[model samples]
Target chain A: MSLKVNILGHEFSNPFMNAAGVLCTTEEDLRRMTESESGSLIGKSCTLAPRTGNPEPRYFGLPLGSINSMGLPNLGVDFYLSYAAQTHDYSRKPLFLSMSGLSVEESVEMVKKLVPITKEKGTILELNLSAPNVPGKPQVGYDFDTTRTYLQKVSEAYGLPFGVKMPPYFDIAHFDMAAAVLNDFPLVKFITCVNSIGNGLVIDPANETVVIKPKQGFGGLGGKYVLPTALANVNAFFRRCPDKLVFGCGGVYSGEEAFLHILAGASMVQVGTALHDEGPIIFARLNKELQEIMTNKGYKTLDEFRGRVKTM
Target chain B: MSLKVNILGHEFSNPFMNAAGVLCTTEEDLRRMTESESGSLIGKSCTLAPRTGNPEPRYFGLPLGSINSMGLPNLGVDFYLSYAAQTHDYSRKPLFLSMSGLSVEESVEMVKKLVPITKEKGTILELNLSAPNVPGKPQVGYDFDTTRTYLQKVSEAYGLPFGVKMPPYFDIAHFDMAAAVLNDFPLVKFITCVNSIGNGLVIDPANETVVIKPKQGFGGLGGKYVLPTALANVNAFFRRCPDKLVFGCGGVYSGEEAFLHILAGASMVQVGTALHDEGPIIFARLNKELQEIMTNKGYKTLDEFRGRVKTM
Candidate 1:
């Protein structure tokens, strides 16, 4: 069984990839992902300048999943650009360059700076509009006007295809509003549904204290805790934005979740919490498991069941 | 270490209660709950007419949580009113009668019918504005205008204190909007933060099929999967609606989670999935655990830590 998937005029050997901000914070991490069996690679989401992020204990894992308030810690956009300039090979494994800026002006600047590299190297751009732990800054994906403004600026600045990583939207109206906004931008080629669910608080019962140490211990949630939500967002957008591709993220641990995402209409699936816990080799295991699942069902390719979740 | 709570001018021996639509589907269930250790009791959310709910296999349980599209199966508002009239005893345990209607008119009619009983018997009214499984119907909690309309009609018709059972809100803007709407209704004495997260789909990978039978396997999510979102909602309304009480529901499984809810600003914590799994006896365990937590912290009353989640 072949798990190959085609999106954005490019082909992937499989549908699995790392959600940005997992094990993709440095050149070494990117290298590991590139060398792994993942169909694609994404670097850490970068800002215009380097950041130290929040204080210690900003991440905590539970039985079901994990929470994080890393505050967009990264080595900056220029460092990633310098790395991508040195090593970006599409034939081997496509690279998705992710960036999250503090402000719209800063994001526009990064988009302009990213254009030449993307045009030359076939590098995919993933604009992260949702980062939950940025102190006073709210996620752009949650505000309709802000989301439209960001998309408009990026569409004008780059004049090329790209995608936006969104936070999980719980309301049906929110899904409709977000999809309508994205649908207006033809330059937007794909959408990664759900960044982490923002502002989730985890408390340690024994300590009588909040788990993480940012925003009063509130952070983004991922892993099994968000699987149902991730599927909802993927399918909501998939059904809403027929013209664009939807890449599912959040709560993916194994091939079972990956398959669920594809069946829910995601063209590709990204792993977060599990990737952090298990490392890059999880891709190979997930790939094998997906192949086995496909073969068991007498399926040869992902497309046969992709976006065909049987609704009762 | 007393777990006593005061809400809506009534005192409870403790703060733990059963969320509507758990084990309170029939008189036998209500009798069991009244005989259990719960501080309060609520019947299954009732519609204007009795409903058989969705087809079989309409519920599925996972390790972390569960999903259901039970479609508001109940014995109707009249049956609950009769049960409350017969068995409700405020000194022993307060009874909360919950009702969900298909339309604004239906809900208003039920509210008018419930006014005399609530006024005479001191029965609390919980208006379920977020039933997610009914086909071709939308949750009022998600639509601000519709929510406003519903609240206005119910307030005018009943002219008494009530609470609303809401669905989870992910966006900060949504929390603000819903809170703003609820704030307009002075008759709304308390607010139940979160019913179930709507339209969540869980797939069974082994069978290659959707888990539940309603809305094509789409159902409301509960238990651990919704704990973070539940806390977020409870705290959001707690912060936003200062004039009204906040009751926390969703994702509550044990004393630890119930304590988290209280810290997040819930005056009363309600159990659903856990109550369904363990029956009413789970309340005894939760009450004991909460007492232990408070005792360890040297807290004599719940107010010492209620809504006091320390943020960095």
Candidate 2:
């Protein structure tokens, strides 16, 4: 019960929440998240209009993790915004509304609409710039010039605080480049690290074929397979982006990983592949597990260990 | 008998070999690889001076893979060159001499020494441009301009056909940039796609601590966790570098992955984590498994399905 943490002048009972585009797609999904034991509620990353996403077999579960090309399959920003307008009053928990536009102009238009409701309801805007499933479209976050331009347009359009969802960067130079661009924009309040390891292909050995059916069987990787990468991204940004809070995503399967994320310097931990597999109820178990770890370590509050990972 | 493949005009009875830095560090190791079932032999990547690498507990094995900050440990270039000079007539199998110089000048100097012996022996040079474990020294492959400069220097220094060992690139733009630089150098006859996923941090959950001992428990990732990423890199380069051969590395523990690597466009596949764990004898098992796979798939030659992965 003492797992409460404060970020951006708002308090969350716990650090656990669902990642964008996991179990928070439809109204029912959002409602379930609201009713579940998660410390905060986040909606699916939606585009300006509705989308059916990729074809069937676009997602495959592996022994260690998952591969998915669920290409922004959502009911659109309007559906999520309408729900966000009402859900803010239902509880004291924080709300996050994610937006993944097809273009910069579409994102600007969506943000223009989001400003009033977000400001009124105190909802956090998570701008997804690294949706890998979209065919023929490159990840905006990977293109630094485009990322800077997008940030300028969005910061001006909304004039409110927001965060960006980033793709995992394998190079230190890339981490430096991304952080330099992000630190230049103070309006970008928080940064959610690591959308997924993009363009990874998993093959089914027995069938001698690729597993997923989209983009030639390539998709974003999630779950245990990405934990190390996710932790590295989180720690890199946390060390670089001193002024902004980092929300960690990718490869969070249980409380152990969640604890590691916090230790790696994430203000909040998000559940993705695990949430898709176990539903929202996994939050309670994660919270319990995190609490047990804290209890065993003789800590009563997250502050004692948050961002305090010891290095050899 | 049908598993033979040709790369860079060199014939190999099979396409499997150990990646640099695993099971090929010393004379004993080299002799084992020479006498083993491997179709080819690649020496450990070495610097001008010997390095003891990071402290003990520098590498940890997990259920899915391994995290290692070996820090380029080897007995130096002279040792490997001495071994290379003698091993030229040891067997009919082609020889690969890998060099990981600490600086551009060092690399040029080593190449100067290597040119005479390499020309006499027909040994292929494997230039390691991406060793992530060295503290304070950024990977050369990540800095495009530096990589270009390095490539230009090495290409001019050696004047013979060589290839680069690259770190896994998660972004398409990076692939495009790296390929553009590599294509400019005709002396670079082939490209080895993906050395390792760099700067991954694996944590021990039961102890709530980092696994490896170097660089704050951050190291290069290998094994099954990186198969998707490895395939993606191999395929990306194969699609981009039409004039160069692509050798696949990272996450090849079995023949199925090796088949997938070739299917994704790699002319040859290298084993790292599996080699470190199982030693030189793994070559025989991998060969048999690959043969069984080829037999079951009704394919007789690697050319029939090489670089033929289908996209939706």
Candidate 3:
């Protein structure tokens, strides 16, 4: 009868939500997302300071996908925390604040100073460990020890349940290693299985040049291009760590892909390029279509089929 | 009339070959590959001593792809070096000796003892930096400084042109940094763009267990799951380091994908899951299909369309 899904002792109207960096760039953007038909809304990745991103032409849309080197452009965490304080009406729907700091010290500092404010404001926090758009900064997710140390520090500082957004890991040992690091913190409630498949070059060979100007046209890839990879990370962590929930990201154009993500062991699904292309209005369509599929399959709740894929 | 491709002054009959961990496991496998229609063949990854690999069910096949946790199983470098010594027919096709060590010291040791033998035997060396099946080992490609250090040592030790097989990198900074390191060594002649999307899980909700047995259902993912990522890595490296060459691997099943790889900037392409599923005979069909596509597009050589993707 409903698409309600539970998360960290809270329930959402549906399982679909906006990924961190796609449609949540501004206060207006966040407001629109909350008012949309989606179950939850997340803010853009915020840093300690506000800075302009890479040079012009930082993002370009392809036919089947999109690429970006936005370089973590956002208002300071203080501004977002202020915004969080202003918007304390989660009784209507859940809102997630995505956190991305430039360095581990910077990240730890943010957790030390920022977590209390967000906790006071009743906002769910999603630590951003995977932002490939930055030109010089290496993602913390790529280095296992740094990731472990960061999570340990943040979990200790915050001492609360939150989700960590991760880049997709391609090796099983990496999965085992990362899962071990995460399981070390029981308060690390959920893990968003992937960010974009980063550092791709989309060439306009006709001009003998690249599409974006940032870092000589290298950027993160999203959309149908990353569907299978999205599915892989979601399913891997779901099987390995029974205690943590896996949030599926990377590829979701519609209800079909969303269904596949759920079947791949994703309890929550986040949309990016699709949301960027279509406006906030897309949540209505995705919700309607997903329920239509569930009904056609004689299912009543997302819990019935989440992570229950038929493997060969 | 020639489908010839050149790497470090050595000419290959064609660019289609088997990726390192697929189809080339034993002396018989190596012999069979040399006899196949491929332009080149690489031997199984060689360590100091033979490894039995992980337990059974380390690999499983799906309709769309395959997963593996082969645990670097082989008869060690001595056996492969002996095989390399016996096979002295580069005039027919080039033979590449793949080396994978367990650690920085272990990898250096292997390169120390193995490079000279391969050089004496007139064989090409491919440094395998991204084998994901091992449980305790982190992939070398993911760690930048270590990768740079390894290549510098190996390149200095070998003092000759060779190949570096890379795991796919997902960040622009990673590509820039990796390309910088690889470009540092002129002896690092060719860079293999990827080595499967590692550590994916396949679950059968029907059984509530994982399909593979290694690392608690952890394994490397290949085939249809890796195409867009494959294209992205190839093109990123192709555009980043103009002085170096990129060899495409992952997500290749048919001639269409092969042709697509060339268009995306691969000088050559390697097959894994498809080759595993269909056998070596897949090469002829793929070559024929690729040539047909090239011909249908009114192109005469692989060089014409290689690295020439048009992006709007």
Candidate 4:
């Protein structure tokens, strides 16, 4: 009768969420979006060390999306924990912390700080192993060996349910590789699909010059352009592993799009780039629209359509 | 021998540019990205009224992309022109003022205000005829009759090179309709492909309800997800009008990506959502990367590969 859905045995009030990485560079921004209407707030991708990131020319704009080489700019785990602790009571929506690491030790250290925050705040932890913006680090959830090792360390370090955030691999065969890695660690609760594709750029027309200058001229791509690709990836994975929990993220801007994602195979959907264009209000707007969609679709509960792919 | 290309006969340092929204909200953010290595800084999308926009929760996050129902939030034409006047000296990058109108009369009125600023600041004017977020008003560039009337009015009112920003309609047949409209106006110089696909919402799982509430249930979808669609749109338009000037504006994030856009038929490319992810430094990074791509491909200038689709 409602939109409520279950992920890894945990009941979420809604499937809509604030995707990791956006204006959440500060705790204030995170608090604002979470309290406004989003089901959950996924914090900015955080690292162990404080990062100022690349200099002024770090961001470029495009019609479909924006590119940035922010280089994991953050105030470090300690600062985040302190900030999280202060904002814990003020946060009306549930909090989901998204963390990233450059190395094994860094990953372990980051999660170690997060474990207590997860318990104290009664929030979730999302391990971001798929950010294309971070350089020199192997994608954590893609490779079985690396994923397993990373999960082992995090699972051992933290007792809370932790989700793995990964990029969409076009090849379904890669799901098996992911499953293999996921199977190694029972503590890994769920998977959020399709991180932004890495390192795209735009050039100036006057002299035929490049616009951005870091990471060998590459940046992550997001928006409606990737919807089909993200849907295809989720659907393929759902077909391959029906019981595993999957969260769809990428190019979701409306209720119809969210319905499509759920029908394809996502237990929940995350909104990232949409926030960049519309501002914070979209969270509440999506919730209202989803209700209308449920009414129009004659569906009582979200579970009825969760992964209910219609055949051609 | 530089990678920069020309759009509407005006020379740009590069094809990468900041579109008219968000970045131009304040003189500070505007000056920041403009001073960076971006090819140009397109000021915020402005209208006749000083818009405070809808209540709260205007923006929402998606995994790979974002949705915004910002309602064309701006400080109006008067404020924008004044801001432009102040920030005019901040950067050497080409500055383009993006204007939006609720009607043909309004469009002309807005352009009239921009004329002095354009001349005083030595910048270009981009008439945004297609914004998915605005309500009640018919999109100016979508219909043949309305577009012709709108462009004709604005062109007559302001003798400036004006870029028409449009949503990429899927039907190639629409080109004939658009061309008919274009022929009516002499000052309408170039076209920018694709805006965010308009409004929708994502349901929340926890409460079995929608998250965000809007008069409409959606917002525009942008990011890497829309790249293929944008490219196809650009390619089709270029095929229809080889000599026409176009600025590819969707889903471009890096130098290589920008190069791909140029190859598809764009005289230049605009960066939008990518800036949301990377930050200001993305322009410099993209410029450097584009140069590398040009060097490797052995292309002397952007024209060498503009619309150089091999398959056709």
Candidate 5:
């Protein structure tokens, strides 16, 4: 049997996904990833209106990883809808529309907008609860009371299945908060573990200054370096809440690495940094490598090994 | 008069070109830029054999700029030749092959191997003399004696027109050392100013640790943040030695930025970071923008404005 991972009761040919950030800014880039071996492609983070984002020097390069203070610079929901229309033909994989908001009402409203698109296009919605780059927003999915209220409002407002994307924090409060929120809203079908860690920066001793110039002095960090941290967080969540579906993200560069995420309790793994380095070819390479690994391990299907790791 | 920028006695359509380490790894990527309005295309940095480069975390993301530790990971000379043979046919513009080396012998060997290809394929050669990423070797063109010896050896061995690609440094010794070397080598056609600054790293204060790993810390910093430094270095070199052909590089993202390099005495300017952010579209955009700027300024060709600031 081939590996089969399910998202919103829809079976995917593989469990590998393209992460929310990196290069999903344009319709062409999104369409390319969806047509690749990726199980699902997350659209660029969207708001109510188009935003030019921060000024120059919004991105910085670090030795360990890249920190981006893009501040959700995007063409907004309306512009994104038009772009999404162009990607409607990418039928090789499902598309996940990632939406962000500052308030519960706004969050619900964004989902409300996505409901028609989801119904018409049969796409998924990914609620980004932990984008550290944006300012003046409380840490969603970490505050139990607030998160539950927000998730309930949005889930009830829309008919489509939604997933929550969060960062990997050691505190169980985040998981507890998300679990509590999801309990009240069965429409929240999946959970993506770990957004980029925010406020990360690199300093040049020669210049004695920050590499990136942001009010926060840095941005979210992602790449192969964060995989271990991301895996640990996913494993913790899986052990505590086995009933919930999880998507592993952060620092996934290769299929072997993707498998490690699955072994660590992720139903699916999201890839971001590798695309930045290897370009679009990563999806094809990843699919080939992942199939090789499954064949060698004698795992016939994704469900047989999904989140099957043992705890000593 | 039109931009009379000459490399090896051959005139280019303009002085603005693509730099060595942009995204010229693939033959298609190189051809795309070459066919664009840019005066020339510098192939991605290449060595004797295919090198996978360092593991993950090769690139660091920052708020203002980026740092990369790609370690010249390339598909070797033979692979490049095979690919270039196919892709080079599509473009009629001048192509400059950037040759990178770990040692003097390696440097010589690389040029020796490519000298015939230069003749057969009708391309120029740019010896990358001062890449900071390579360990233990004195940066080429950093000192008078070392620069002189290396350039002389390559000039003698290849008997072909060659140019040196240097890094940005405040020290007059660096430029003087390079100039001193170039004066001795008749085969040296020009000098390209500024490779990215090396050994930049990002650290996360919250975690009290580095963001990336498996490879050594520190990477080459590039992007808009480094533009001023790059311009200053190139201008300084031109002011001191007006006779030598200089190719200005670094942090150039637009037509306006390209003009700044020309006014600073660059026979040619190389665009690197801009392509990293904007993709291949930048070349066409920059050319159109540049022509408009030139027309507005009442300049007929690139040469009329080239180094005009120097006279002031």
Candidate 6:
């Protein structure tokens, strides 16, 4: 079965990619992702300056998934830009640059500043719209007007193809509102379905205490606990915002989840918690699982069934 | 540990109750829930007239949870009302009447008509606010204004203590908006913080097809997939609207999830996916599990830690 997926005039070898904020947090992590079998790469989400993230015990891994309130920890935009100036080689594999702003105004400045660098480099920049774990940063994507105005300025500044990383939306009205705002920005080419289920409190019944330290055990959730919500967001945008494409994220531990994401209308799938837990070597394992699943399903080419969620 | 939870000027033996639209969809199911050790029972959601629901193969179960596009199938408002007319005895157990209207306009009308019957019978009316599976029907809870107007009308018309069963909200802004809206109406006593994780698609890679029949494979997701979101909504609402109460709904299979719900600020906890899988008998298991957890933690009552998420 052919796993080739094409989106916005670019073709990827396979749909498997690392979701932003997991293994993409540092130079070594990006190198590991590049060296692995993943079809694409995304650098860590960055602000104007490097910021040390939330306190220790910020990340907790579970049997079903993982939680983290990593508070936008990164090496800053310049550090990533310096690396991108040399490391971005499209011939090797497509890479994604995630630039997050420290404030609403900063977001615009960052996008404007990024356009020239990424355009010259022929690389795609994924504007970080949703980072659920950041303490006190109510993700910009949650406010319709803020998100709309933010996108309008960015799309006007940068006419090149790019994407926005989104948080999960539970309501159909939220889907409609978000899709409507997104539809206004034609230059906004792709929509990443979800980041992590935000602000979930993981309690230890044994200790009657929280598991993490950041926000006092309040963090973002990933892995199996997010699979259904992940698929819901992907398919919702896929149906509502047909002009833009959806990149699935949230739950992708194995091929089973990856396959379901495709069936739900994701053109590409990204791994977060699993990649962090299993290391970059997990990419090869996920690819193998996906191919084996497609082979068993007798599916040749994902295009045969993409976005075919038979409407009732 | 003390499992007692008081809400709407009444005390319950325990906070553990069945989420609407699960085992409560049938008469026998309600009877079993009442006969079992559950502290509360909510009748199946009903429309003006009986509905046949979507179709067969609409509900499916997985090891982690379950999915259903049941399409609000029920025996109608009259049947459930009649049953409530005779069956409700708060001394035995608290009973919740879930009446859902089909359209936006009908939502107000349904509440207007339901107030007399429920008020006369001394039963609590749970106005089901969202139904993700209805063909072509957008869940009202997703639209801030719609939900706002609907709740206002219900509070104005009913003019008594009733609850609103809500769908999960992902954004912190959404939580603020929803809680603000609910706060406007004090008569809207308790907010059930989740209907289901809506519009998720589950695929059977072995068959290369969607799992459920209705809406192809689109259905509302329940069970473990919703635990994090559930906790977030419950805690978010609890913090946002101190004047109002929050009832946790979503993922509660064992006492572990139930205990987590209470810790997340839920005055009450409701079970869905697990109850559907294990029947009413699951209540006993959940109670035992919750008590064991509380004992291990050396807590005597839910009040010891309820609504205390320990934010740093």
Worst ten-residue run, lDDT, model 4 chain B? B208-217
- Candidate 4 residue lDDT tens string, B224-279: 55665576566656765554577787777777678778887887778778887777
Instruction: Look at candidate 4 and tell me the lDDT of residue A138.
Output: 45
Chain A of candidate 1 compared with the true chain A, TM-score: 0.98
List model 3 lDDT by residue over B30-122, tens digit each: 877888898888888878889999988788887668878889999998888777776546666888878998876776777766666666666
The candidate 5 chain A region of ten consecutive residues with least summed lDDT is A199-208
| Candidate closer to the true structure by lDDT (higher is better), 2 or 3 | 2
Task: Kindly give the stretch of ten consecutive residues in candidate 1 chain A with the minimal lDDT sum.
Answer: A200-209
User: How do the residues B1-312 of candidate 6 rate in per-residue lDDT, one tens digit apiece?
Assistant: 788887766678888888888778777878888888888889888898889998878998977788889988889877887777776565778788888887646666666766766666667888887888888778888777888878877778778888888887765666777887888888887889888888777777566677788765778888888887788788888888888788999888888888888888898899888888888888888889889988987889999988876644
- Please provide, for model 3 over A45-69, each residue's C-alpha lDDT reduced to its tens digit, 9 standing for 90 to 100: 9898886777888888887688888
Per-prediction TM-score: 0.93, 0.95, 0.79, 0.53, 0.50, 0.93
Between candidates 1 and 2, name the one with more favorable TM-score. 2
Among these predictions, the greatest DockQ belongs to 2
DockQ of structure 3: 0.26
The digit string of per-residue lDDT tens for model 5 on B1-312 reads 355466565677777677787778876677677667676787877888777876677666665566676778777877666655556753457677788877678878877777677777767788887665654444555445667767878887788877788765533333444556566666776778778754443444223234445223435667654554466566656765555677888768777777777776678888777777777777678777778777777778777766655210
TM-score of chain A of each: 0.98, 0.98, 0.97, 0.91, 0.92, 0.96
lDDT of 2 by residue, B1-312 (tens): 388988767789899888998888888888888888988889899999899888868988878888888988899999988887875444568889899998999899888888988777777899999998888788999888999989999999999989899988776667788999999999987788788788888776566678888877878888988899999889889999998899999888888889899999988789999988888889999999999999998998989999888664
Which DockQ-derived CAPRI band holds candidate 6?
A: medium
Better of 2 and 5 by DockQ: 2
List model 4 lDDT by residue over A266-285, tens digit each.
Answer: 88898878878888798778
Q: What ranges in model 4 sit over 4 Å off?
A: A1-312, B7-10, B206-211
Ranking by DockQ: 2, 1, 6, 3, 4, 5
Q: What is the TM-score of chain A in candidate 2?
A: 0.98
Give the clashing residue pairs of candidate 3, or none: A170-B198
Task: Between candidates 2 and 6, name the one with more favorable lDDT.
Answer: 2
User: What's candidate 5's i-RMS value?
Assistant: 16.0
The stretch of ten residues in a row with the least summed lDDT in candidate 1 chain B is: B83-92
lDDT per residue for candidate 1 within B219-263, as digits (tens), equals 888888888888888888898999999999988887788888998
